């Protein structure tokens, strides 16, 4: 994948390019949407709970 | 490509997401730009030509 400024893009190069633009576009809209619903709303920010769970030894270097 | 609801994205999930948005964004601008300069201008489509450039045999081996 070398950025070569010269020869025109071929048919197949245009195909992979237009589906590139549409792929990154459709995912951008969806994944940015959910990113905003996470960070802006803060509905499930993980408030300071009772840390007493089934927590094991993180490493235990003797 | 999974879809986990309830709790939001983690710190590292937000990191990979924001760099995702910025990655696809910067490339989109650049690669769409050159796509337009190719197709709209038509400065070089490689016009109608003779096959005499040392054309390879399609299946003339047998």
């Amino acid at each position: 994948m070398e950025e070569l400024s010269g020869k025109p893009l071929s048919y197949a190069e245009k195909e992979k390019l237009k589906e590139k633009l549409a792929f990154l576009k459709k995912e951008y809209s969806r994944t940015l949407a959910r990113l905003q619903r996470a960070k802006r709303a803060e509905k499930a920010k993980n408030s300071k709970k009772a840390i007493e769970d089934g927590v094991p030894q993180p490493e235990a270097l003797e």
Side-chain angles (χ1 to χ4, degrees), chain A:
Chain A
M1 177 58 67
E2 298 69 64
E3 198 284 83
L4 300 177
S5 308
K7 92 292 166 54
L9 43 72
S10 305
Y11 182 87
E13 304 305 288
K14 179 266 290 189
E15 298 299 305
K16 71 184 59 170
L17 224 299
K18 57 80 185 177
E19 70 182 79
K20 153 175 297 299
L21 302 179
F23 172 64
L24 67 79
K25 178 181 298 297
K26 65 189 182 61
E27 72 171 287
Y28 178 79
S29 180
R30 184 179 185 151
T31 199
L32 181 149
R34 69 186 302 128
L35 211 181
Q36 302 305 329
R37 298 304 183 196
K39 65 180 300 186
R40 293 279 61 223
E42 300 170 40
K43 67 292 176 65
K45 61 175 60 182
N46 183 215
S47 184
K48 193 286 290 66
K49 48 160 291 186
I51 49 72
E52 54 181 81
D53 295 276
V55 59
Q57 68 298 273
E59 178 177 81
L61 197 289
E62 185 181 301

